[PDB]
Design a binder for this molecule. Sequence first.
Ligand SMILES: O=c1cnn([C@@H]2O[C@H](COP(=O)(O)O)[C@@H](O)[C@H]2O)c(=O)[nH]1
Ligand SMILES: O=c1cnn([C@@H]2O[C@H](COP(=O)(O)O)[C@@H](O)[C@H]2O)c(=O)[nH]1
Lengths: 212, 212
Amino acid sequence: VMNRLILAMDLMNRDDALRVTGEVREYIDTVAIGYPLVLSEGMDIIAEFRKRFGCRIIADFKVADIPETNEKICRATFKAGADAIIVHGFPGADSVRACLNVAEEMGREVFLLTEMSHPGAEMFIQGAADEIARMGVDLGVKNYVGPSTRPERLSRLREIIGQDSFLISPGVGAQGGDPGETLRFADAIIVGRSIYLADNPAAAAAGIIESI
Amino acid sequence: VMNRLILAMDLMNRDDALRVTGEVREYIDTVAIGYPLVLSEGMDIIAEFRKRFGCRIIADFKVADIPETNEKICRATFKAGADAIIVHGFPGADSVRACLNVAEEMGREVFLLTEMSHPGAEMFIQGAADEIARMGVDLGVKNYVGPSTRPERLSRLREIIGQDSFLISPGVGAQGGDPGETLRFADAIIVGRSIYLADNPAAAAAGIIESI
Ligand SMILES: O=c1cnn([C@@H]2O[C@H](COP(=O)(O)O)[C@@H](O)[C@H]2O)c(=O)[nH]1
Ligand SMILES: O=c1cnn([C@@H]2O[C@H](COP(=O)(O)O)[C@@H](O)[C@H]2O)c(=O)[nH]1
């Protein structure tokens, strides 16, 4: 992705989300849109962003349901125009396969979330993360999400998925992760608050890019 | 699109197509892939390009069949990963609507080809072009294709579709169209041979961009 930087657009109103995204578009061509914005403004916001900014959109929906429901969520999300969707791996292989099947049918991509960046991830997710990553490899997953806040875990994840897989990483800035260190292992970093809550989002994005 | 320039990749072998596209990727982020490449290397080439170059892909398939077949062609094309498809308008409204319905279902876009750039277009297409464009407006089409070789016709087309519609235009360079003049009316120009047959495709792309 451009400058190896993905904007996590978690503002909850359309006007502010459009303003900040437009201000940083010269530095970023990929935006992660999640439920905070979608549940506040509707799924139509995805197509609006894609058209207005000409950016790729990753739906950060952390899909985590049974196979049948996962298929419906993925279909609705790709119908809305998303280029990719983030899916949790802890619910198991059948749930991930359901997402992969819809992405195959619709010409889109699935990103498998393996270990999360927040403190609570140490309770249950971290202990299953290596196996979740190996499961992804076994299913043919080529895109993964791992934690900026734990570079030793990001390194282990990169080890399991190989150099050919694409790995993106949130937890940079506000959560404590460092851009440069994270990019030693991840292909791109996801940054939300450090950019969208900044007094000058464009200056914040430019500063992150210059630091790397 | 980046630099308002779209590469028409009509080489017929994968190695040469990948080489030229990689050489000009710093100048272009949108590639039109048509049947010369797809019928020679397979539909899988679309996903390969999208991944390898991170570019948007327009399938320049000039869809021109009955509604039922158009739906199948569009479904197969979007399944392959194309972001948009070019559809002929001369076969009529039902044929275009079939394409629009599949694009809506799959979160993608349809570009309506209204008047073609080659000499033969004067025989039958030119006389129906204004009505084909008006039909597109009536159907809700927002993306159009018009001829670089006839700027007065491109102007008339822009007049019918309005300033809000997106208009791209082939026939630049080899066919005689001028980049600058075309961009007075079109949002982006499509260029094939002037770039892909050049001794230095990157220098050719850079030269077009500097001229505008
Ligand atoms: O393990 C994960 C997975 N996803 N995200 C998401 O990535 C973004 C990070 O935002 P931030 O830069 O403001 O902390 C938010 O959308 C958040 O839901 C994390 O932070 N950690
Ligand atoms: O009216 C039209 C519609 N489509 N194209 C297409 O646009 C490209 C133009 O290539 P060129 O720059 O090599 O002439 C080719 O893929 C061609 O099929 C035209 O040239 N004219």
